[PDB]
Design a protein around this ligand. Structure first.
Ligand SMILES: Nc1ncnc2c1ncn2[C@@H]1O[C@H](COP(=O)(O)OP(=O)(O)O)[C@@H](O)[C@H]1O
Lengths: 420, 438
């Protein structure tokens, strides 16, 4: 044999050393991935479509004579919507309505405000022209990620939402494609990895250059986004798939085991960690892991993730549990404790938080629905009246002259009215 | 020998390439400036404090034996406050009042909301632990930048606001340090360039690793900020110093020439361009420039920048003026026209906009942030993720009731099972409750 999950104890004097290592895992080195991503980016900029096709065959195991075989018509998204089940389609449509209604209320357009002295301030707001959405291929690709990125882009007025979704060995995810259909994706290319990000950032003969790339992605996508920042807007660099469970010991150990498995099954570099002051509970979770793992469809992925990056960590009390959690700074925190609002203040470095025994971290990947700002460009506007320029100019005049910026000062002074 | 501003005319058939070269020529390469930056970052990541002191001696020309001589105590900020004149201190205090008022109105905190089924949703809002503020050295450092960044950080509750400001040959801008005192800066290091950015992004023995780096910067700072992206939060990376003025010819030509000088006096590489359909006007601006330039206090820097990147550009009409403006794509646009809101629909690539004849682009550098709205009580009503939001972290929370977990769990089960992610499914299914189960 049974699988034995790694065990750490913060009562060990050397516990900080093992925790550091657990948090700095170089499966494939940063440097190796970085060089590979840099080379692919430069390759896509130099050779365009030909490079995209060549990398797609190599990394996605796909046969494609040309870039035209890597274009999915929007009609294929409509077909996907007919192919999923009644219950799947209803879940997606219900979540879409809630996401879309929410963003309609939050949208803020151009505005102007007139001060008492006549000065007008405000912002001129324009949708981005195009936005690119990365969608991981295959089964481990949450449809919520499509809905929650494409819908606010369309609500903002983005004319073209371009989706890139690799098809590993030709595999297509109909639920994901159906979500893309509901969310209003305009164009789809079956490409992935660093080459998809590069094609979106710089453009090729067939892939349009977009103004912002959004979405999740593994280390190749994250590294490519880091490197095309500047050339294109980027929402964020999502970190590796991750869950920290903190438990007081009074949650069912099968539930906790499964909560760890939920993240570990996403991909082989996911990290799942449990922290608890309850030693007997940690033993129960270790047994649950050993028993439940061979019953999992994705046991191979789950085992590899837990061998490389998982751990159960014993701590002394609530205070130490929070200190270790804050150090881990988890992107996803499950506070499986009696009074979660009592633990959160001591874990300010955590990302998304799932509270209590009844809130599985997995619900965060399949959110049923409740932004636009991130798909808009803003120009700030100042239109002083003569009186407003006098008020502002008096302050600027003094400060500028103080540091010898006399063109700044005289520029402002030309519009200062003399007082009564 | 009166100065003759460079003249361009869109009617010329070499205009596209002539303007292309004016907009793109570079002294040092991208690769060499970028290569020097990549080297400096690796050096301070490796040699820590020693690299910072070495780069500071070489590039700033400072006689500093160790990192402890590059630390300015908070008292030195208070002393700056007493060294500036009364009118300068009050001007800093007035500016800080307007900034601080605005950010207080914008500040949002944590919240919770209980759904009908008992599920609690919300957000936990906390300040960043530490923020790092880059402040240019010398006289060309806007005190605005200190106020505009340190004040929202303190209003957010950032417990340690760290400022870096190079002091070339020991020169100190007392107004800038006084601004830092008023804005509540906690610690100051007299360092700059890429090495300052890297010391803040990664931390050294004496410089603390901060959660976000903000502020303006020259090419080395901007390049360094681009490279430490993903390693540490950053704000918008400011581009090179630049102004495009578009005028219909109905603005006093001296005002326009001085608006060009305002940007030109910042540094030798600054780019100041005027576009107009009014040919007689453009001549009056050329004369204004010749007459006004000699006695500018920074006449030599203005002349250098106008020679290298300045231009007066003749166009056929308003539409061609806007086409040229769109090709330049200015981060700072001065629409010095009678009807500025009529020109804006045809301006599609522009950052911050100064409208009409009474709005000098100089006011941008002293009363607003980079492409930020002017802070007033009225403008505070319009939300922005800039400002106090910059320096805060937001954690979404969900606390399902048993019934909420059941409703959400069924939908999670359907979609996760549809994708064969059965750990997701079973984890959600464990919480589904059926009252009739004994
Ligand atoms: N040629 C260079 N190589 C490396 N760093 C440089 C070079 N020129 C300037 N720097 C860095 O940029 C800083 C210049 O001071 P700063 O005020 O921030 O920019 P500026 O004065 O041009 O506006 C220096 O501290 C220095 O570290």
């Amino acid at each position: 044999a049974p699988f034995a999950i790694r065990r750490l104890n913060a009562a060990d004097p050397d516990f900080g050393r093992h925790l550091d290592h657990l948090l700095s895992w170089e499966s494939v080195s940063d440097d190796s991935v970085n060089q590979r991503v840099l080379d692919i980016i430069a390759a896509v900029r130099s050779r365009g479509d030909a490079a995209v096709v060549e990398f797609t065959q190599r990394f996605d195991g796909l046969q494609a004579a040309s870039m035209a075989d890597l274009i999915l018509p929007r009609e294929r998204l409509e077909l996907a919507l007919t192919r999923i089940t009644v219950a799947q389609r209803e879940a997606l449509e219900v979540a879409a309505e809630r996401v879309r209604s929410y963003h309609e209320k939050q949208k803020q357009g151009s505005w102007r405000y007139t001060e008492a002295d006549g000065t007008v301030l405000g912002q001129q707001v324009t949708p981005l022209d195009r936005a690119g959405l990365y969608v991981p291929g295959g089964k481990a690709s949450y449809p919520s990620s499509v809905l929650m990125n494409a819908i606010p882009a369309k609500v903002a007025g983005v004319s073209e939402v371009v989706m890139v979704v690799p098809t590993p060995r030709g595999e297509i995810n109909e639920i994901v494609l159906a979500a893309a259909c509901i969310a209003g994706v305009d164009r789809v290319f079956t490409i992935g990895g660093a080459q998809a990000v590069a094609a979106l950032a710089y453009g090729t003969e067939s892939v349009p250059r977009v103004d912002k790339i959004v979405g999740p992605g593994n280390i190749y996508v994250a590294t490519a986004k880091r490197h095309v920042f500047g050339q294109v807007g980027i929402d964020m660099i999502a970190g590796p798939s991750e869950i920290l469970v903190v438990c007081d010991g009074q949650t069912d150990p099968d539930w906790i085991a499964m909560d760890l498995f939920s993240q570990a099954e996403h991909d082989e570099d996911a990290q799942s960690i449990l922290v608890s002051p309850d030693a007997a509970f940690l033993d129960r979770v270790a047994d649950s892991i050993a028993r439940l793992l061979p019953t999992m469809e994705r046991a191979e992925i789950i085992r590899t993730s837990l061998e490389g990056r998982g751990a159960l960590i014993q701590v002394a009390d609530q205070a130490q549990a929070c200190a270790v959690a804050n150090r881990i700074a988890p992107e996803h925190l499950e506070l499986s404790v009696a009074d979660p609002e009592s633990w959160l203040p001591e874990i300010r470095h955590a990302g998304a938080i799932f509270m209590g025994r009844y809130t599985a971290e997995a619900l965060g990947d399949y959110c049923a629905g409740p932004g636009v700002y991130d798909f808009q460009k803003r120009s700030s506007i100042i239109n002083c009246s003569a009186e407003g320029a006098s008020v502002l100019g008096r302050t600027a005049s003094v400060l500028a002259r103080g540091e010898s910026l006399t063109a700044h000062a005289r520029s402002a002074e030309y519009r200062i009215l003399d007082e009564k």
